[PDB]
């Protein structure tokens, strides 16, 4: 209970998560890793679900640090930096995005939602459009990360066809994604969404 | 083996999937539902993983019917209709999107990828931008559906705070999403992405 300080159980869980993925993670494997009996760990942590909720929240604490607008930030810059920040959280551990999936939102998060809307609307968005914008940026980001993370968890047993059986376009696509990874695609898409809203908001009174 | 025709095992699995979700789905529960011994079912279906691959593909066969460009369709219309179609597939069964997650792509799908690129590039996209566009529309769509589907699988035990403890913006947001559901947000975001690429492609030789 130094061994079982909340912050040490959290760190152990994170390291386990990286070792075995969300699949493998069990309260049992945590008990062995910490070197304690299962009922001792059960006093602190009821089940796999309660443990994930804590992992989800921790990841967001450490890394999702741009969750509100900086003093006189434009809404475009805010949306962009908030999406990047949320993404750094999801990526910070193996299966980050699945861990995040289905965990309840905390009270401070609701409050943050509220401010995020106050801000956007004070920049001239209708409430409808503010919600559509935060929603789209979030889906896009979440979707980016599940795919990227599904890769190296499917990397183990399955494999791709060899690079040289491919039709020639697909073959240049491999070269290209080899060189850049996935960050540039994410950034490009983020930037297209934000541009598309910009054309949206410039609509204001009429047709586009 | 009328009871165990491939198409009857598939339909049974789909119905089971709706009853218990991806979590609950086991080859064992399938054996009981079909009324056969587990080793008889095991002759046809090796494991949970092989079964999901078949469910993923079936869903896409039945519903993802707009996977290539219609005779003289514009690329905007194509992107839009393809995203909608992929989405109808994911939504067609409980946990559709998770089922889809990690399943290998079939040979015809690679071939379809290739045509989709041939088309976009023949409409004046660079190969880089064609890939960024298909990628963003896909992430966004996948992300939309996991969230929408996570809801009614978390609906069971957990509940939201009551509508009347909310700050007033959040409270109008509830009204609004009550009335429209989630389709309109998806359509709006799809349409913003596509607009954002449009500003992209109009760049062509210069700065935007």
């Amino acid at each position: 209970m130094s061994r079982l300080d909340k912050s040490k159980v959290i760190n152990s869980a994170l390291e386990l998560l990286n070792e075995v993925g969300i699949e493998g993670l069990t309260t049992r494997k945590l008990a062995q890793k910490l070197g304690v009996e299962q009922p001792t760990l059960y006093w602190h942590v009821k089940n796999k679900r309660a443990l994930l909720d804590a992992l989800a929240i921790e990841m967001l604490d450490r890394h999702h640090t741009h969750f509100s607008p900086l003093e006189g930030e434009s809404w475009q810059d805010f949306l962009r930096n908030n999406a990047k920040s949320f993404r750094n959280a999801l990526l910070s551990h193996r299966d980050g995005a699945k861990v995040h999936l289905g965990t309840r939102p905390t009270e401070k998060q609701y409050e943050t939602l509220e401010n995020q809307l106050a801000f956007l609307t004070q920049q001239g968005f209708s409430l409808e459009n503010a919600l559509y914008a935060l929603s789209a940026v979030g889906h896009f980001t979440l979707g980016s990360v599940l795919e990227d993370q599904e890769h190296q968890v499917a990397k183990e047993e399955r494999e791709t066809p060899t690079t040289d059986s491919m039709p020639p376009l697909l073959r240049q696509a491999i070269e290209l994604f080899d060189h850049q990874g996935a960050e540039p695609a994410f950034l490009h898409g983020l930037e297209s969404l934000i541009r598309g809203f910009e054309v949206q908001l410039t609509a204001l009174l009429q047709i586009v | 083996m009328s009871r165990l025709d491939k198409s009857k095992v598939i339909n049974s699995a789909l119905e089971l999937l709706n009853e218990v979700g991806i979590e609950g789905l086991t080859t064992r529960k399938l054996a009981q539902k079909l009324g056969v011994e587990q080793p008889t079912l095991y002759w046809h279906v090796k494991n949970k993983r092989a079964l999901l691959d078949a469910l993923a593909i079936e869903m896409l066969d039945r519903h993802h019917t707009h996977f290539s460009p219609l005779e003289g369709e514009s690329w905007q219309d194509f992107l839009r209709n393809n995203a909608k179609s992929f989405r109808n597939a994911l939504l067609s069964h409980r946990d559709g999107a998770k089922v889809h997650l990690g399943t290998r792509p079939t040979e015809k799908q690679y071939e379809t990828l290739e045509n989709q690129l041939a088309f976009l590039t023949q409409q004046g996209f660079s190969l880089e931008n064609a890939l960024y566009a298909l990628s963003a529309v896909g992430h966004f769509t996948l992300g939309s559906v996991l969230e929408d589907q996570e809801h009614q699988v978390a609906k069971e035990e957990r509940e939201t705070p009551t509508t009347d403890s909310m700050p007033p913006l959040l409270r109008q947001a509830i009204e609004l999403f009550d009335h429209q559901g989630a389709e309109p947000a998806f359509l709006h975001g799809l349409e913003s992405l596509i607009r954002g690429f449009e500003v992209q492609l109009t760049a062509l030789l210069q700065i935007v």
Binding site: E147, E150, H151, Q152, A154, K155, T160, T163, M166, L170, A173, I174, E175, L176, F177, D178, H179, G181, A182, A185 | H64, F67, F86, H100, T103, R104, P105, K108, Q109, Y110, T112, L113, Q116, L131, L134, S135, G138, T141, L142
Partner: peptide, 13 residues
């Protein structure tokens, strides 16, 4: 690396 991205994209067809 590249092989997996195209795998992702092909999956959605």
């Amino acid at each position: 690396r590249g092989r997996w991205q195209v795998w992702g994209l092909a999956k959605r067809c």
